[PDB]
Amino acid sequence: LSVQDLNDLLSDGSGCYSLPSQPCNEVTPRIYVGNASVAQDIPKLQKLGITHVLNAAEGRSFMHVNTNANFYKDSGITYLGIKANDTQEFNLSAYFERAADFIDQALAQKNGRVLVHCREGYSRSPTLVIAYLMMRQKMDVKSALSIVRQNREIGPNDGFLAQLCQLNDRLAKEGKLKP
């Protein structure tokens, strides 16, 4: 397992990452990854059956989505904001546990559906979703990234990829990767 292996898995035959066709996708059952516009479109969110929104890019910058729990007050949607940045040096793994718990809590609900989003739905939000699949559904990093990629064109930055590899080794050694 290397970052290079994950880069390969994200590349088409031509050698290039792809780009999201849609504003969001269901990447695994009841887990959606998506962008700023779906997150701010409550009508769409209900048509999708969304009960929980995880903003993986909470903030005021151009690379952030400036929502909070209040935005969703009278919609009955449950919110969690994470102020993550999309850079190779940003420590997203510090957020994996709290993101994984929020997603587990949403899916524990019978008709629960969670949207994990950032601005483009390409790097932060898919990293959190992968790490969740590894830590709670016992999927190794290659199969977790493969399934998410099969359902949405994504490209986590190489820092995030490194952090998923580190996580993958820990889980492996802990015997936690066996579904």
Ligand SMILES: Oc1cc(C(F)F)ncn1
């Ligand atoms: O039950 C499931 C299924 C999947 C997907 F891989 F099909 N992911 C997570 N939980």
Ligand SMILES: Oc1cc(C(F)F)ncn1
């Ligand atoms: O948005 C997407 C992406 C893909 C991928 F497999 F290329 N398939 C279907 N819908």
